[PDB]
């Protein structure tokens, strides 16, 4: 039936008006001296606790004064304000006490809202505290989310004071999990040692349970260092995705010992012409084809941001016109390998160029043309506040401008107006630029001297920042004139490119190049074969970030050999 909602809202606003002037107040709740007159029906039809307390037919339904203990006055006031309206005003300062009061009062709506709010607000500073909270209050979803977050950044959060005050079950369930993102077992060993020495008089009996969870006879990646590295070129990654899989889980190499440099191909293309905005991850070591889910809700024109902790992110976005410009934010995880929805921005960034300047992602322009107050708007990415504070905006429209941080100072070279993009002073001190006013200048983290190869015209200009000098190398080897499909990459902190200059058909000629700085010469690194690597585009996002091949969808879907000579 179409239950009337027009009468429902008038009755609700009338009940609120009556409650504000204290009419028909039949119950009086006493919390730590403070009195609150209220109606029994509203508390019953909102909280299952009050419903059971009133429907019992005892003196609680007859006495007008009810003393509620272990309940905060502010939380009870917020609950009543929800009981008489339904809108919840939650904040990061009083969300845990509100959730405690709700679970003590059993308000399904408030409980679910606080649960989802805590889930969508797990950061790397409260992960352990929220995990302890969920363990104390038995919230399985929040507990699992906080456990995954701790496993993702264990080496960064095991120093917090909340980690040493954890219970025994939390320790034995965190250490036993094979999802610990640690490069060496010594980190987990020292974490267990500091945990057991934090409070010795109460944990002296748990030393056996502590030592039984740390893998000592694992010898994951040291045994390969003992015998030799003798294998096909860098085939240690194949052993990673082999020995790990088949393991009794007691000597298993932790997930952090599987993290290996991976080519995160965001908004990439595939052999299928329909999937021209899909995603195919690649390993520059094991030479294997993996699958990726770069588009979350078919979100295109986004901006990949890999943090130093290897956490790929996205900015702005564009859903297919139901392109419908959207702002839904998404964070690519590594353990679950999924995009996490969060607070949307105020400006739709069209394929933005952003980096973690000073460990802090900034929304360096990466928009369109039509107003400096609307587009080209550098913002800030509040990590713990999960907010998007606006900062000094980019003066002119600068598109296809690779954003590269240099000495904790963004040095984004534009068409022909480079500035001193400051991550602290937020100013545009015109920095040494060039004379070629062109964009499409591919550049990755190349250290002191950056190289903005590209111009759609592939001059390898040297970008000296310390000496503030301006030299030049040469050009990309081609024929009469090759097509500039420069894709500057940074594999394991190196000066390389993914030039896809199509020559003799074969989709695009994917040839990686070796850039010299001390010799300042011109060489070639590797040559990605087209037998597996099919159409991938000419200027698509190709970030490089350490990722687990075990968690990466292991799906090649690309037949190698073709063109049989049988005819």
């Amino acid at each position: 039936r179409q239950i009337n909602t027009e009468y429902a809202v008038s009755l609700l606003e009338q009940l609120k008006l009556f409650y504000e002037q204290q009419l028909f107040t039949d119950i009086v709740l006493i919390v730590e001296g403070t009195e609150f007159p209220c109606h029994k029906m509203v508390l019953a039809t909102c909280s299952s606790y009050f419903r059971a307390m009133f429907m019992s037919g005892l003196s609680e339904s007859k006495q007008t004064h009810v003393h509620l203990r272990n309940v905060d006055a502010a939380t009870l006031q917020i609950i009543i304000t929800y009981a008489y309206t339904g809108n919840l005003a939650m904040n990061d300062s009083t969300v845990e006490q509100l959730y405690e009061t709700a679970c003590f009062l059993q308000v399904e709506d408030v409980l679910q809202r606080c649960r989802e709010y805590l889930i969508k607000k797990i950061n790397a500073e409260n992960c352990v505290r929220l995990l302890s909270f969920a363990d104390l209050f038995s919230c399985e979803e929040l507990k699992q989310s906080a456990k995954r977050m701790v496993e993702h950044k264990f080496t960064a959060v095991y120093h917090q004071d909340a980690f040493m005050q954890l219970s025994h079950d939390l320790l034995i369930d965190i250490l036993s999990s094979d999802n610990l993102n640690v490069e060496k077992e010594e980190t987990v060993r020292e974490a267990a040692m500091l945990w057991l020495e934090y409070n010795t008089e109460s944990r002296s009996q748990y030393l056996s349970s502590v030592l039984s969870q740390i893998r000592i006879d694992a010898l994951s990646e040291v045994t390969q260092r003992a015998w030799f590295q003798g294998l096909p070129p860098n085939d240690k990654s194949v052993v990673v995705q082999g020995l790990y899989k088949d393991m009794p889980k007691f000597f298993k190499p932790r997930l952090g010992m599987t993290k290996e440099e991976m080519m995160i191909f965001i908004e990439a293309s595939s052999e299928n012409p329909c999937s021209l905005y899909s995603s195919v991850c690649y390993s520059p070591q094991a030479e294997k084809v993996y699958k990726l889910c770069s588009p979350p809700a078919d979100l295109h024109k986004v901006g990949t941001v890999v943090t130093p902790d290897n956490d790929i992110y996205i900015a702005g976005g564009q859903v297919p016109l139901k392109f419908r410009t959207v702002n839904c934010f998404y964070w690519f995880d590594a353990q679950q390998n999924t995009w996490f929805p969060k607070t949307p921005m105020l400006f739709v960034r069209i394929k933005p160029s952003l980096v973690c300047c000073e460990g802090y992602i900034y929304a360096i322009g990466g928009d369109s043309v039509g107003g400096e107050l609307n587009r080209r708007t550098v913002e800030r990415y509040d990590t713990e506040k999960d907010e998007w504070t606006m900062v000094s905006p980019l003066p002119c429209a600068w598109q296809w401008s690779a954003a590269v941080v240099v000495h904790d100072c963004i040095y984004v070279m534009t068409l022909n107006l480079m500035y001193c993009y400051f991550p602290r002073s937020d100013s545009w001190v015109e920095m040494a630029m060039r004379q070629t006013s062109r964009s499409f200048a591919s550049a990755a983290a190349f250290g002191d001297k950056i190289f903005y190869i590209g111009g759609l015209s592939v001059t390898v200009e040297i970008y000296d920042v310390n000496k503030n000098e301006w030299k030049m190398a040469a050009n990309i080897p081609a024929k009469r004139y090759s097509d500039p499909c420069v894709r500057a990459v940074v594999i394991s902190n190196s000066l390389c490119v993914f030039m896809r200059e199509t020559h003799l058909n074969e989709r695009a000629k994917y040839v990686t190049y070796q850039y010299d700085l001390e010799l300042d010469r011109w060489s070639l690194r590797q040559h990605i074969s087209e037998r597996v690597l099919w159409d991938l585009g000419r200027d698509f996002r190709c970030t490089v970030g350490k990722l687990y091949p075990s968690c990466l969808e292991e799906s090649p879907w690309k037949p190698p050999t073709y063109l049989f000579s049988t005819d």
């Binding site: 081609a478 024929k479 009469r480 004139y481 090759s482 097509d483 020559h503 003799l504």
Partner: peptide, 20 residues
Amino acid sequence: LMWLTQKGVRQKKLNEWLGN
């Protein structure tokens, strides 16, 4: 042909050099 046309030799210009 995968070098001159790749540089920017328009097909119309190629037809002029193919017609003289």
